[PDB]
Amino acid sequence: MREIVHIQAGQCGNQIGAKFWEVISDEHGIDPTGSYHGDSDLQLERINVYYNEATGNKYVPRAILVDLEPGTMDSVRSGPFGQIFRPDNFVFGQSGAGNNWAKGHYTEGAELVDSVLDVVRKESESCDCLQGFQLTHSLGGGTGSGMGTLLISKIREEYPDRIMNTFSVMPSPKVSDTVVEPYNATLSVHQLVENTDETYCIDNEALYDICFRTLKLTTPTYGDLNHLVSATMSGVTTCLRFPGQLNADLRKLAVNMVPFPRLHFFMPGFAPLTSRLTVPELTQQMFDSKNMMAACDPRHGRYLTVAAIFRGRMSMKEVDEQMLNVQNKNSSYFVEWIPNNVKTAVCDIPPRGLKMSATFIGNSTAIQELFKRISEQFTAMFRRKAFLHWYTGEGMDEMEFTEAESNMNDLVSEYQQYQDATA
Amino acid sequence: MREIVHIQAGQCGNQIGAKFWEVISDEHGIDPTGSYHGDSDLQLERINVYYNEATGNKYVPRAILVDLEPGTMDSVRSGPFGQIFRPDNFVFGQSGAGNNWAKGHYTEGAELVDSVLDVVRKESESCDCLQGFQLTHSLGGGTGSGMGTLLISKIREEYPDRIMNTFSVMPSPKVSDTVVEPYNATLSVHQLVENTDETYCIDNEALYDICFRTLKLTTPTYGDLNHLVSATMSGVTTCLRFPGQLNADLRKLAVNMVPFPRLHFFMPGFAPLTSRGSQQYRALTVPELTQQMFDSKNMMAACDPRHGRYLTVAAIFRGRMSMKEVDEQMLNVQNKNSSYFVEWIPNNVKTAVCDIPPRGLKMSATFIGNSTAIQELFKRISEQFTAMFRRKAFLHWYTGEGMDEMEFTEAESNMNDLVSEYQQYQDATA
Amino acid sequence: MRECISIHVGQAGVQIGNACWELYCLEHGIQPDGQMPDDSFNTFFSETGAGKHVPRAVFVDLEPTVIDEVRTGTYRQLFHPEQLITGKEDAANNYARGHYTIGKEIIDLVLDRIRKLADQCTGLQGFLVFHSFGGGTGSGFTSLLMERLSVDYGKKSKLEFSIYPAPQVSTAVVEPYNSILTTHTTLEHSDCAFMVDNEAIYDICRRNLDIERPTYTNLNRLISQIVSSITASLRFDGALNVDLTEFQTNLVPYPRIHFPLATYAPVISAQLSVAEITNACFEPANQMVKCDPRHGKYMACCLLYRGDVVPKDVNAAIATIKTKRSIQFVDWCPTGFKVGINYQPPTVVPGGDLAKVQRAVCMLSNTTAIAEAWARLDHKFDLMYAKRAFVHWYVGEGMEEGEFSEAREDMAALEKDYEEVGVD
Amino acid sequence: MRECISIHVGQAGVQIGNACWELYCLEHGIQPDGQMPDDSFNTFFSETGAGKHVPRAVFVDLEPTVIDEVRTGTYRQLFHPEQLITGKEDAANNYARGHYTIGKEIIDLVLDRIRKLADQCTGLQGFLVFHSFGGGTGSGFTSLLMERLSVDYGKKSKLEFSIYPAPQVSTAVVEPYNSILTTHTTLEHSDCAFMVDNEAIYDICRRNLDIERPTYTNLNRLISQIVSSITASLRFDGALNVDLTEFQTNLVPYPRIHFPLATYAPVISAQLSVAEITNACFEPANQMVKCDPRHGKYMACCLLYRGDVVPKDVNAAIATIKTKRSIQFVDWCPTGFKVGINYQPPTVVPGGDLAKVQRAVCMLSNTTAIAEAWARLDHKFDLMYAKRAFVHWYVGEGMEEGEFSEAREDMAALEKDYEEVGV
Amino acid sequence: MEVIELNKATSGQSWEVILKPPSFDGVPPSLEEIQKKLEAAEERRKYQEAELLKHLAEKREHEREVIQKAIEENNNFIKMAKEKLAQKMESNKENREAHLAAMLERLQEKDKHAEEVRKNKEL
């Protein structure tokens, strides 16, 4: 449980994946040329979780960049930290996915998938002890969605005993790129239920609502949304990257956060929300609906488990006080049949620009609201068979569509069943 | 689709055919020796539609001259431009048809037609891309009517995928050469209904009426009538001889002007009407050209267009004028006189413009109509046919050559059938 | 990689091809000999060893007159002579001749030359077929070509740019017949077809450009701007690109309902904001097909911006559009918006009528209102066909009357299909 | 000679081991290099040909970080590499993973290293096993090891020092599961188990040492003092508890009821009388396991004095509490105490938070009140097992679901056994 | 109380203090079995992993059948387009040749009739 292999697929996957490497490199003190220039040895203690050891005091991200379209690769390459990645970890096709899950999963995705697995297999052997994989991608498009879930399925067949973790961006009509997002997303949620161990649900609907309502951004752009994503991704990986009491790793996160295998979709949260505070506020704001990166009201359900990380110099006594206080005051939003289901961790290093931050991983039954919203948009199109011919033309049967949505509605019912369970 | 093969048959055929070649040769800058003396290049652009290029920098009309009477082609060689025609394209017999259709079609004309097919094949095989044939002839005589319709049939056998076009001069008792002209014209019309794709109806009745009533010629001659014929023939071939928008050819004309295969008899019109060799002191304006063109006094067929309805209309304006002003007079004439156009053929009136006017005129318009009113011409012929055939008058002129009464009854039946279907579409509703 | 082959059929397709390839050379800095002082223009231009950039294009016309002007015009060295294919006789405004009698004599040669172009592609996206509805070659030969292309290349993407016929600039009275015949025959074989109404382009040239009697050259230069907007996402590397597959995915909800409505703004006589030109795309005056979208429902909106455009401004403009109640979408479309932004400003032919602008947009929208255009065409068809007017010219070339009613019934089913997809 | 072998399993077991062996060296005058200027210390220390004194100890932690402490720590020279057993992957807070997955892998290697220590003993008494209840290694591997030590050393005594789970410093939500599982499997295989409730130790560090947020080191410094008091008469020439067999003789009348309660006094922040520290032995705020002796009856009670303690003072102190207090023994057992004085003075780590005192005492009593600790654990187990929350992580390692209930039934019987004798 | 001496040694002494005597006189797996259970838990691990890989291998073959079906659809679209086109092209050729043959047949009947006319004349 040392190294994580990171994968980014498709346009969205590679944009937020690049923003992520940008952010944690600044945290661990790595410049775009791969040299270390930081001021603390806390930064280098577990840096091999994400960075490979190159000869010449150079740190290279253990990242694999994937796309069926070559344009995103060039954009990443010319980006700020473009030169830090291993140039032979770029695996790109030529003819795109056409916003079509069926093309990413079956046709165009299959022709490129073995080139990707070769680079995955090479980084896996340079690992003293492979902890697992983290994948960034969107579900609404074609490459990250269809080819990303194909990657997940093939990686699980070759590494059945490694953890699979995904950052999955959910589509919203408020920030759409294609008219077939409800199909692409539903077909991928089906895959994620079966083949991942942990999935952070990054809801574009919530990222937009946060930028418009809280950050007073009248016209949110992807740059504004990705600022929230990079902050969230830094927060939810802090315990993997910096030393602490929990010796946290991806398998331990799954053991304590996933009481039932299908219910592994997390509600991320972050405080303070910033456009491009005190401990009692950090504790409260973190359980606030306005800080959830999934468009769900946690007060509409119950928390099964909650993992929370506080960053910066502060009284862990005062923090532990407030966390217990909130739990007692909002007792009806936590299941009673799981003793001590809210865990606190602390890290002395604050994120860039901030002096105190708090990041929230919640397993809440309210996440069914995210999946009900996708299910309604799916049924609205699928009942008229709108655009279905672009998927049947790739070889898919209609059954795969109905099966995927039945599985997603079962997940909804399953979350509901444990919302109503009592002691 | 470039080359057209021209054929003129009989006295009237060769007379209006010669005038046609004098007029368009002047329009293209060709002198009676075949040499180009013109100033513009547009005269020469599509000049191969009607002319072959003979070595010596010369242009020979792609024309074949036919008559059973020997004398009429002697007069052709003697007339102006007589020396321009290919001498080997003259095909003459030594006895005319005596104004007898049967002599032209069955007996004497059939003994000369293979000699004509000789010349027709040589001019046709020399063609890069043969549009088809245009034939000038009268319907009231014997050679142009009888041997002309025989020639059509024989040519259609060897070239069935080409367009067959005629300028057919209808007989009139006001300008008559025999009392059996109703017979000759009805027998020829039978053939034309079956074997041509496009026929321009040149009515000697309308030509005489125009010369007498509008031009005030008290005793008009064939020269007077033929000035109107050559003005019409020039106008309706302008889009074939000069560069324009439509890339016009004989087949496109047939496709767009003939909604039903048998209803291919066009009523030509022309403005301004003039006497031959007369200076026009004041030119006509675009509203004058447009109104006078749809006027019954300007039709080369003695039919009132307001007695029927147009199926299709093609109109060509010649001279320097505003295509915008033309477009708004034409569309106006249509919208005002809406009840003389069938409603079930959208966009059935087409307009073209050519900057080069004809000689002697600063501006002119020419009209090609497929109107149901053309049934008045065929009814006129049919009544004249019946008055004779009731009495079997002069039938022995025809049976004496081999024919039978049944061939008369059939041709009369087919022309009365043609009248009925014109009436059918005149009354047809949308 | 990612090559698109362009095929131009008949006078209309060829002359519009002249306007388009001339504009491409100006956009990419290519000289009329193919020499040139972002390599995305390679999707439309192959390159020879001498550095000469040759269009990936075939020009086909059954008569030599129009293509001879290309062979002796400004860009006569731009194309290889084998890409300019002519017969000697045109279709005489007759679908039957373009598709059978005259078209069968040259179809093999065209496919052989297209196959040699396909052999020069490492990743063919598909074909773009430029043609008119009303011409005998634009209708009949295009249908034959589309059928033969389906056989030689299977389901490979085939898209059209079709000229919908207009009385003001007509060439034949049987144009409604040719239109319905080619639409029936081509329907199964085309993935997406962009229609351009000549009358709509005629009116824009008069209102916005103050041209009293627009010529083909005036019409084509505006049409070339729309075409350039569509293919600029393939020829330029911009912020948001849209390839041939994304056009088909985001604009075609059902295989038969594949006729997007094009709009363009600004059309200015030789700077408007992103919001202004975006709002103009929903004003019916700027539409390339005469119809009323306020009387229909949108099913998909693809906006292609070029020039000085920032994504924040497009997001703000589209957000405003989503508030207007006069712009109605179907019940089954959670969102119908697709956006592309290429950064190279719109080029204008020096000596033309259009003014240079800093930003512009072409919207492709699939609306039920375009069925109005199918209704006007089918009515003109019915007027003449009720009497079988002119039908003998088609039967004489081998066609049967059953082919007419079968084509007209397919158009009735198509009209009904627009009605069905518009309900709730 | 009466050698005892110490075995440390999991992070808690190792890090407490570091604290105890450090304290042993300070008590016996062994320097960090193993050199040394009463020979009873040889029961815990062997000697090398170079004159170095080496703890009779094996360390098992399959996470290299913790054992790397021992390799690079202050007393690193005390230990030989074949005493330290590590791996690459820990148990991920999973009993089934520690017991079945890693247990089958490492058990023979671990027993082999134990055999090499036992071959250096002329009269091995048995084993002292340090491990947590809540960790996946501390619970899962320890139980397998105890099973096998019963096989390989049938007649040898086995004592445990077990860390009882507390939410304040917890590392996993599944700690109640691991706790019940390891108690069930180990029950037949241990003779005497001293439980150390982390919450009791936490409370003592806050109240008596004025520490707001006690660390692992804080807790381990206090636990070492208790372990030292319990083992002092083994490491010096004492009178009471002079061999492991005597612990079950003096404290364990019934084999299942082998969980003595430890009370310790004084804990002073960095001189109380015999009577005062004796009174403190009967204040529940000083117990190492939270429970109420008023809710139970004593079966056995030993007082282990250390330092300056004179018998007349002890007997006077015992006489005082007899008159004022009621101390209910079970009917069948005498009401009284076994008293031992060890003259060796109480020793603290220099610079630590514990102050050096003149005299100290540790009371070891077998009360039925310690069943309350089992009842708290059994209820948390019941809350989660009713919904089978997290059970799939245990089944995924090859454990059968029936083992959960079979283990819980054994804890039901243990609770009833405590009821029967506390009648 | 009753004190009872237990022991005296170098580093300490012990004794026993009795406050009250008891009310009541008196007091009221093998190595193979272990390996058997560890091996059974391993075979359950291996069975579960075999069943996971079996399901993933079933998805691999569905992925092949999808890609195969799309190739069969494209081949059938080609074969049906090919037969349809050859059907109409040959039907159009038969029709057009039949029209030209009737046209030339009518003109030949007239040719025969012109012979009957010239025969009737000499008669």
Ligand SMILES: Nc1nc2c(ncn2[C@@H]2O[C@H](COP(=O)(O)OP(=O)(O)OP(=O)(O)O)[C@@H](O)[C@H]2O)c(=O)[nH]1
């Ligand atoms: N916008 C535009 N329309 C044109 C142009 N040329 C012809 N058209 C239209 O196309 C239709 C006629 O079809 P064409 O393509 O010109 O004819 P064709 O394909 O050459 O077929 P044939 O000439 O009959 O063999 C008419 O509706 C014209 O208005 C052009 O250059 N630009």
Ligand SMILES: Nc1nc2c(ncn2[C@@H]2O[C@H](COP(=O)(O)OP(=O)(O)OP(=O)(O)O)[C@@H](O)[C@H]2O)c(=O)[nH]1
């Ligand atoms: N008193 C004390 N308790 C500790 C210490 N370290 C861990 N614990 C407790 O031990 C329990 C967790 O078990 P550990 O033994 O540390 O971990 P492990 O068995 O190696 O865990 P795995 O990761 O599953 O292998 C928690 O209840 C902790 O509070 C320590 O140093 N002192």
Ligand SMILES: COc1cc(C(=O)c2nc(-c3cccc4[nH]ccc34)c[nH]2)cc(OC)c1OC
């Ligand atoms: C207009 O002038 C001429 C045109 C042609 C000619 O080919 C042609 N007519 C049409 C036509 C006819 C009627 C209604 C119509 N609606 C749309 C087109 C159309 C299309 N093509 C030939 C001519 O003479 C040889 C002409 O000159 C008089």
Ligand SMILES: COc1cc(C(=O)c2nc(-c3cccc4[nH]ccc34)c[nH]2)cc(OC)c1OC
């Ligand atoms: C606290 O913060 C994090 C913890 C972990 C992590 O491994 C972990 N969670 C638990 C846990 C979860 C829920 C209830 C619980 N009761 C006792 C333990 C526990 C145990 N271990 C990973 C993280 O991100 C990588 C974190 O940061 C957000």
Ligand SMILES: Nc1nc2c(ncn2[C@@H]2O[C@H](COP(=O)(O)OP(=O)(O)O)[C@@H](O)[C@H]2O)c(=O)[nH]1
């Ligand atoms: N938050 C966020 N979402 C994005 C970004 N880019 C694309 N998306 C979303 O991703 C979906 C489109 O998929 P995309 O990644 O662009 O297509 P792909 O290349 O086939 O994977 C839509 O829901 C977009 O809203 C981004 O930079 N940030």
Ligand SMILES: Nc1nc2c(ncn2[C@@H]2O[C@H](COP(=O)(O)OP(=O)(O)O)[C@@H](O)[C@H]2O)c(=O)[nH]1
């Ligand atoms: N308009 C016109 N009609 C003529 C001319 N010559 C003869 N006709 C008419 O043609 C008919 C006589 O036919 P004609 O050509 O002389 O007989 P053919 O030579 O045997 O065919 C009569 O109706 C005459 O009015 C002429 O030069 N112009």
Ligand SMILES: [Mg+2]
């Ligand atoms: Mg043409």
